[PDB]
Amino acid sequence: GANKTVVVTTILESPYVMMKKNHEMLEGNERYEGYCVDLAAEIAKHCGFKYKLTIVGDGKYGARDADTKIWNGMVGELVYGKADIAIAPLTITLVREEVIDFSKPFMSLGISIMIKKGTPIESAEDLSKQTEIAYGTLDSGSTKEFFRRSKIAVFDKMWTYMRSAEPSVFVRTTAEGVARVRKSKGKYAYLLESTMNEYIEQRKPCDTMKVGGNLDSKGYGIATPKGSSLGNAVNLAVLKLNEQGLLDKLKNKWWYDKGECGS
Amino acid sequence: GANKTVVVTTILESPYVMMKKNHEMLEGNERYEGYCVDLAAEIAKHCGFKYKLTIVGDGKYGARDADTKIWNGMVGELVYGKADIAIAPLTITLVREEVIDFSKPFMSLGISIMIKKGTPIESAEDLSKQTEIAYGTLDSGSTKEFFRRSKIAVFDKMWTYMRSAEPSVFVRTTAEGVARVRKSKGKYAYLLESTMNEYIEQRKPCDTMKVGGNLDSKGYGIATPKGSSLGNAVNLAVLKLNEQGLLDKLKNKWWYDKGECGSG
Ligand SMILES: Cn1nc(O)c(C[C@H](N)C(=O)O)n1
Ligand SMILES: Cn1nc(O)c(C[C@H](N)C(=O)O)n1
Ligand SMILES: [Cl-]
Ligand SMILES: [Cl-]
Ligand SMILES: [Cl-]
Ligand SMILES: [Li+]
Ligand SMILES: [Li+]
């Protein structure tokens, strides 16, 4: 049939998608700026489609309810036919790969630890061996699932603590996790992907840092409904953009050229 | 060959696939050891197939000959139907993705610089701005194509030099590039993926090192012929093995530092 505007699901998560200055009087895609706004424009150009950015209704990345088996987040919007493509920092995982299609990675990353500067923690092992400093993860995504499923002793011990900690150590949005680190006087550390950890380390008031090595090695992919004809062209576009240096340029633009914590 | 046996193409490249000691009295898959030998056994177990390891006939990763337009290397073995799967440090690239299928990555890496210790080079930019120290890449693979196609000023400058350097700065095998660094008294640097660079830096004679950051961010994938029924299960197996920690365990085994250089 005739060309139709592609519905892009994405998530309001800095620096991937942010409200532009003057958004209150702007419409459509012009309301937004950021790494995934730029990436969406590049993918659409290389693939020959028009598109509308739409922020995921529930603000989640995507997980499957263990009881109902219903998917939420951006994954659910693809699974249930509400969006045509997700262009976001959506981690490629086994349980998601089983229900949606993914491009090859457009970013490489791993789970990491964010501390308030001066916190006496250097590693996940350190966190697991003490109780004075609380720690947690984002809800409804791949980091929480990593700990829930891990059979590695250190990560198992961490999950056993996190799942029963009171008050809850889990947060609904990345920003809430950052705030809890910044306000907790060193008594909360946040488990989040290295990409975001590195971004926040370059934002005022420059009071957080990444410690330890990454816990795993994975990637973000552009996602489509399973079997969508759109997947092939999108994947070729990701590989071309990576090989041309454009993805490295975009990361540098939004992470380091715009950094607030000096040169 | 025997029915129901998956033919695996792979490449003799340490520590991915190596001949075992006393391999001459061994037979079949038992001749070989290494990271990709272990990975093949894990993938085959998860996917439920029997398999035969074969070393790629021409010893190449895979490129399309510009004149004949025929694919060589492991890519060619898949394209022309001589193998059912490639399990090797085969880089996921655009031109390869157009002709074969790839799993999600099982290893993440980038192009890097190997020098003989003491060489006054810290970066690709450093290489591009001088002519005393020669430098080159492997033939018939993704690193040479990266420079050939790049429009980044530094990399374009490097390609313009490399393509016309005499004698040739390109080598037929990774080992030959490493040997050239070691024998050239600091007057040759070698452009190769970080995985191998890091492996060699920890091994005797302890005379090479990696300098600078990686030039790109890429991955190795398990490859199958386009549309093969094997691709789906193989991809799910790679993701499961990564999530169980087994890929990191295999890396830590085959990159294990026994202290050949320094204290270990
Ligand atoms: C920074 N950061 N940390 C996380 O856990 C996430 C979400 C993840 N990318 C997903 O897809 O669930 N993002
Ligand atoms: C160490 N190292 N450097 C390279 O260039 C290679 C080959 C590459 N993985 C390909 O697929 O062509 N391997
Ligand atoms: Cl429309
Ligand atoms: Cl022998
Ligand atoms: Cl440039
Ligand atoms: Li999938
Ligand atoms: Li492909």
Side-chain angles (χ1 to χ4, degrees):
Chain A
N3 290 335
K4 191 171 184 179
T5 301
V6 171
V7 177
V8 179
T9 188
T10 192
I11 187 158
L12 202 69
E13 188 81 283
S14 301
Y16 302 95
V17 183
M18 306 180 282
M19 306 306 303
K20 270 191 195 164
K21 192 153 188 144
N22 292 322
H23 64 92
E24 67 274 9
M25 65 173 178
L26 299 171
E27 300 277 14
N29 296 344
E30 289 297 320
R31 291 170 293 176
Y32 310 110
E33 67 182 346
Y35 176 104
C36 286
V37 178
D38 291 347
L39 181 55
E42 286 282 359
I43 292 174
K45 180 179 73 187
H46 281 269
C47 294
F49 63 79
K50 302 177 166 47
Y51 64 99
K52 178 181 181 59
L53 302 168
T54 72
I55 307 302
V56 61
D58 67 8
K60 295 174 173 290
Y61 284 88
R64 192 183 78 163
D65 190 286
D67 296 322
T68 71
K69 303 305 186 68
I70 297 172
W71 287 93
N72 64 26
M74 291 178 286
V75 178
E77 294 196 340
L78 297 175
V79 166
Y80 299 110
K82 307 302 184 187
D84 299 305
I85 191 166
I87 301 176
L90 184 66
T91 305
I92 299 160
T93 69
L94 174 63
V95 291
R96 291 169 174 171
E97 180 72 282
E98 291 174 334
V99 297
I100 57 181
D101 289 346
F102 282 106
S103 70
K104 298 306 187 292
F106 67 87
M107 291 185 113
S108 297
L109 54 303
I111 294 165
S112 69
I113 300 172
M114 176 187 289
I115 58 162
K116 183 90 173 182
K117 284 174 172 180
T119 299
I121 291 292
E122 297 177 352
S123 64
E125 197 179 354
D126 284 353
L127 285 172
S128 75
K129 292 184 173 173
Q130 58 83 58
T131 55
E132 178 69 17
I133 301 164
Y135 51 93
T137 78
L138 185 72
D139 286 331
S140 300
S142 55
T143 298
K144 195 173 181 187
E145 176 77 0
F146 171 91
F147 284 99
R148 173 188 291 116
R149 297 291 165 240
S150 186
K151 303 312 184 291
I152 309 299
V154 166
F155 306 144
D156 164 17
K157 282 170 60 62
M158 290 172 68
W159 175 246
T160 304
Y161 152 76
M162 289 189 289
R163 68 186 299 276
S164 67
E166 295 175 336
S168 178
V169 294
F170 303 107
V171 298
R172 287 186 69 68
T173 65
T174 299
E176 179 187 350
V178 172
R180 190 163 178 177
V181 174
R182 289 183 160 159
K183 296 179 175 177
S184 294
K185 302 182 169 61
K187 304 298 183 175
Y188 184 81
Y190 187 51
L191 288 153
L192 82 172
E193 290 164 347
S194 54
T195 44
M196 184 64 72
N197 209 347
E198 292 156 353
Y199 177 73
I200 295 290
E201 190 165 331
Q202 306 294 318
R203 315 303 297 179
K204 281 173 183 180
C206 314
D207 59 342
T208 67
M209 70 179 283
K210 174 162 75 70
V211 298
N214 292 349
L215 303 189
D216 61 359
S217 293
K218 51 206 185 180
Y220 299 146
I222 308 290
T224 44
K226 206 170 185 190
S228 165
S229 65
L230 191 46
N232 177 65
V234 163
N235 180 58
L236 295 180
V238 167
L239 294 175
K240 180 174 273 168
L241 292 169
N242 201 29
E243 287 175 21
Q244 291 178 334
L246 184 275
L247 301 182
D248 292 316
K249 183 183 181 73
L250 286 186
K251 189 178 182 184
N252 290 333
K253 174 185 178 183
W254 290 104
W255 269 248
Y256 305 115
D257 295 340
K258 296 183 182 269
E260 296 178 330
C261 300
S263 58
Chain B
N3 291 346
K4 303 183 181 57
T5 302
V6 170
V7 179
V8 180
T9 189
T10 193
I11 188 160
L12 275 175
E13 190 81 281
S14 302
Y16 302 95
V17 184
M18 307 179 281
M19 307 306 302
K20 281 187 192 168
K21 296 287 187 182
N22 286 318
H23 64 95
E24 289 211 31
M25 53 77 176
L26 301 176
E27 72 86 28
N29 295 345
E30 289 293 319
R31 289 171 291 175
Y32 309 108
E33 65 181 347
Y35 175 105
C36 286
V37 177
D38 290 347
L39 182 57
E42 285 284 358
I43 289 173
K45 181 179 73 187
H46 278 270
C47 293
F49 61 77
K50 305 177 304 189
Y51 63 101
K52 176 186 182 62
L53 301 171
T54 69
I55 306 301
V56 61
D58 67 6
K60 295 173 173 291
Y61 284 87
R64 193 182 78 163
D65 197 288
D67 295 321
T68 73
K69 301 190 106 145
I70 297 173
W71 287 90
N72 63 28
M74 291 176 287
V75 177
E77 295 295 282
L78 297 176
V79 165
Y80 300 111
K82 309 300 184 40
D84 299 307
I85 192 164
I87 302 177
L90 185 65
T91 304
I92 300 164
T93 68
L94 172 63
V95 291
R96 290 168 175 170
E97 181 73 282
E98 292 174 335
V99 298
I100 57 181
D101 288 346
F102 282 107
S103 70
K104 298 305 187 293
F106 65 86
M107 194 176 286
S108 298
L109 58 302
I111 296 167
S112 67
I113 301 173
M114 176 186 285
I115 57 164
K116 181 130 190 304
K117 284 174 174 182
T119 298
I121 292 291
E122 296 178 352
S123 64
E125 197 179 354
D126 284 355
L127 287 173
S128 76
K129 283 181 164 171
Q130 57 84 57
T131 53
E132 179 68 16
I133 301 164
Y135 51 95
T137 77
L138 185 70
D139 278 330
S140 300
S142 54
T143 298
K144 193 174 180 188
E145 178 76 1
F146 172 80
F147 286 99
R148 171 189 288 116
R149 299 294 164 210
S150 188
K151 298 183 171 179
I152 305 295
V154 165
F155 305 149
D156 180 295
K157 193 161 166 188
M158 292 171 70
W159 175 245
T160 302
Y161 151 76
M162 291 189 291
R163 68 186 298 275
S164 300
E166 293 178 335
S168 180
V169 294
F170 305 108
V171 297
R172 196 177 56 86
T173 66
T174 298
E176 290 177 345
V178 175
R180 189 166 175 176
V181 173
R182 290 180 159 152
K183 298 177 176 177
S184 294
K185 304 182 169 60
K187 304 298 184 175
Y188 185 80
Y190 187 52
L191 291 155
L192 81 172
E193 290 164 347
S194 56
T195 44
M196 183 66 73
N197 206 346
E198 294 154 0
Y199 177 76
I200 296 290
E201 181 170 341
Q202 298 178 322
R203 314 276 297 181
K204 279 171 185 179
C206 311
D207 59 347
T208 68
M209 70 182 283
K210 177 188 199 298
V211 295
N214 293 350
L215 302 188
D216 61 357
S217 294
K218 307 271 156 69
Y220 300 145
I222 307 294
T224 46
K226 209 169 184 190
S228 166
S229 64
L230 270 184
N232 175 64
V234 162
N235 182 58
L236 297 180
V238 168
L239 292 177
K240 179 169 272 165
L241 291 168
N242 199 25
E243 285 177 19
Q244 289 177 329
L246 293 179
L247 299 183
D248 294 311
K249 188 180 183 74
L250 283 187
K251 183 89 178 299
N252 291 341
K253 178 175 314 196
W254 289 104
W255 278 251
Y256 185 87
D257 184 10
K258 295 189 182 196
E260 302 190 352
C261 308
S263 60

